[PDB]
């Protein structure tokens, strides 16, 4: 059968909203500035779960193919495209459409993969490590001697942040994950693993550092964000980049009053900083993202970062992939493949 | 009868509340770790104008001698102090007490003045340049190719920030001040001068850079803070370090419970997350006690000075008896650079 497979989001809601639909195998004809490519692997992000629940404000109208990060092979390029050609391995960063067999994207949103890196590391590199880099360095301005709190240090962005913190001299890493992963945390580079499930991490951090930490990374959101503000040392920065507490909390069917708010004078008198980052709402900045991608690839070629994979799932098991992240059962990156 | 002169803030209100008093010149006896020194010059900041109207929460109870930075000669060394000796030219950064002829301060809060540097430039260096360095780099994370909005670019902190931006390559600096000072801006390193009194600086910036700027420095506060938030590029940071919008009407006491919520910019976590901006707050007055941080910053600043990369510009120096004429000089925003104080007539 000369058909292509695609994952489509017909409605907003639970895991069942992602359906497998067919398409008429057609000859690739990307327009000017475009690029048709077949996908080898796809990444699963928390922004994907936010979009599936309807909380991505820049999502195209339904029905639409989900997926924001992919990795595959260029099959064709349109007129005016000289930086890319057929057969090149590329990492794609988009707003939607990455969870299918074949996709046509703007060539500006693709980046060539260096050799010796598999597609699995490539699909596990873009979103997580770009977010960790831009949170730690662009906003957090990570320096030697600093102290960092990394929430969900076992997750993809968490492990990425731990590895990136190991690149800076004398960085105290506070990692939060289940006790079953604590050992692995110390393997990943975490200095003090803390289990937020049994005890309150604020006191566990205050007993080791009474004044707090320099940087706080908050993919949790809600109440924890407030906590992250009060754990800040002078010149400290709390950077929120996710809503894990919303999708991992007791209400996995959302219906939060714990939204943190601050005034300008409160920050002026506390000498603290609040930051918001989300790669989905950032595209359009050519140099801003290209420099980060280049520095990440250079760090990779020096053997200093290596995306770890937790599990790979076919399209037919996309649900089993998403729940794998929803119940926080993943150690690494959850991937999708368009395989039978 | 040799006596020492002091400036004492006796009440909250107009310029008349800061009065010049005197005391007997007792022999200097600094305690352990202390240092007694006679001040040649003292720096006037906007925090002092806030304190005179009661807006400086960390100010000691009245009556108190205000002033955060001074520059003079060490006259007595307390016990345990070995890095300092008599005759040393030092600039000192404290929370209060610097508007007088003699001070006994912790030696760890003083720094040796370079020989090629005058006392006036020394008393004009610490507060403004420390604020500019920590705003642009610690919070703003200034990088080459960035764009910075420097409000009150003719002020002390503003000129310090412009000089500090000129050390990073290809930094476009937007400065807002009245036209009468625009010339002084362009030589200092401002790329696009803007008159906030005759033009709307937001759209004036957007005409040159439609996506905004990378860093915003807000000494104005209030509604302007909100504007600084809406001029931020992706990954942009707005750093508030003053409340110049409130410091009009120098004769009233500005303490109010409504200072906490009225015209106060507020933001939520999701609002910052959906955008790609950050909101920062800084105030050196609410920051003392951490000597290692500030000492590293001061060492870097003195290196930059000796390399000819920064130059403290002086607007005017005033005797103590004209402290009022000093304060209005900064309160009416007629100064280009630093307004200083000198003890003697």
UniProtKB/Swiss-Prot annotation, chain A:
Topology of this chain in the membrane: Peripheral membrane protein
Annotated compartments: Cytoplasm; Mitochondrion outer membrane
Gene3D superfamilies in the cross-refs: Medium-chain alcohol dehydrogenases, catalytic domain, NAD(P)-binding Rossmann-like Domain
GO biological process: negative regulation of mitochondrial fusion
Keyword entries, A-Z: Acetylation, Cytoplasm, Membrane, Mitochondrion, Mitochondrion outer membrane, Oxidoreductase, Phosphoprotein
Gene Ontology cellular component list: azurophil granule lumen; extracellular exosome; extracellular region; membrane; mitochondrial outer membrane
Keyword flag Mitochondrion: yes
Induction section of the entry: Increased expression in glioblastomas and on wounding, in basal keratinocytes. This expression is calcium ion-dependent.
Tissues of expression: Expressed in brain. Also expressed in glioblastoma cells.
Domain of life of the source: Eukaryota
Entry EC no(s): 1.-.-.-
One annotated GO molecular function: oxidoreductase activity
Function: Possesses ATPase activity. Plays a part in calcium-regulated keratinocyte activation in epidermal repair mechanisms. Has no effect on cell proliferation. Negatively regulates mitochondrial fusion in cooperation with mitofusin proteins (MFN1-2).
Similarity-based family: Belongs to the zinc-containing alcohol dehydrogenase family. Quinone oxidoreductase subfamily.
Protein name: Synaptic vesicle membrane protein VAT-1 homolog
Protein's gene: VAT1
């Amino acid at each position: 059968p000369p058909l292509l497979r695609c994952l489509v989001l017909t409605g907003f809601g639970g895991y069942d909203k992602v359906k497998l639909q067919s398409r008429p195998a057609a000859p690739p004809a990307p327009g000017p500035g475009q690029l048709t490519l077949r996908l080898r692997a796809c990444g699963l992000n928390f922004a994907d779960l936010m979009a599936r629940q309807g909380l991505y404000d820049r999502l195209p109208p339904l029905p639409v193919t989900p997926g924001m990060e992919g990795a595959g092979v260029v099959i064709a390029v349109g007129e005016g495209v000289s930086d890319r050609k057929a057969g090149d391995r590329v990492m794609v960063l988009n707003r939607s459409g990455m969870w299918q067999e074949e996709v046509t994207v703007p060539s500006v949103q693709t980046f060539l993969i260096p050799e010796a890196m598999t597609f699995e590391e490539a699909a596990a590199l873009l979103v997580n490590y770009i977010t960790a880099y831009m949170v730690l360095f662009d906003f957090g301005n990570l320096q030697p001697g600093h102290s960092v709190l990394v929430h969900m240090a076992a997750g993809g962005v968490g492990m990425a942040a731990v590895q990136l913190c190991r690149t800076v001299e004398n960085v105290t890493v506070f990692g939060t994950a289940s006790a079953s992963k604590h050992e692995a945390l110390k393997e990943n580079g975490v200095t003090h693993p803390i289990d937020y499930h049994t005890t309150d991490y604020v006191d566990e951090i205050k007993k080791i550092s009474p004044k707090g930490v320099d940087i706080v990374m908050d993919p949790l959101g809600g109440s924890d964000t407030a906590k992250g503000y009060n754990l800040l040392k002078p010149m400290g920065k709390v950077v929120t980049y996710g809503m894990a507490n919303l999708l991992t909390g007791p209400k996995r069917n959302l219906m939060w009053w714990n939204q943190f708010s601050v005034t300008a004078l409160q920050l002026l008198q506390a000498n603290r900083a609040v930051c918001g980052f989300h790669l989905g709402y950032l595209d359009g900045e050519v140099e801003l993202v290209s420099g980060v991608v280049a520095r990440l690839l250079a760090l990779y070629n020096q053997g200093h970062i290596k995306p770890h994979i937790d599990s790979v799932w076919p399209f037919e098991k996309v649900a089993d992939a998403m729940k794998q992240m929803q119940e926080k059962k993943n150690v690494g990156k959850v991937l999708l493949v368009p395989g039978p």
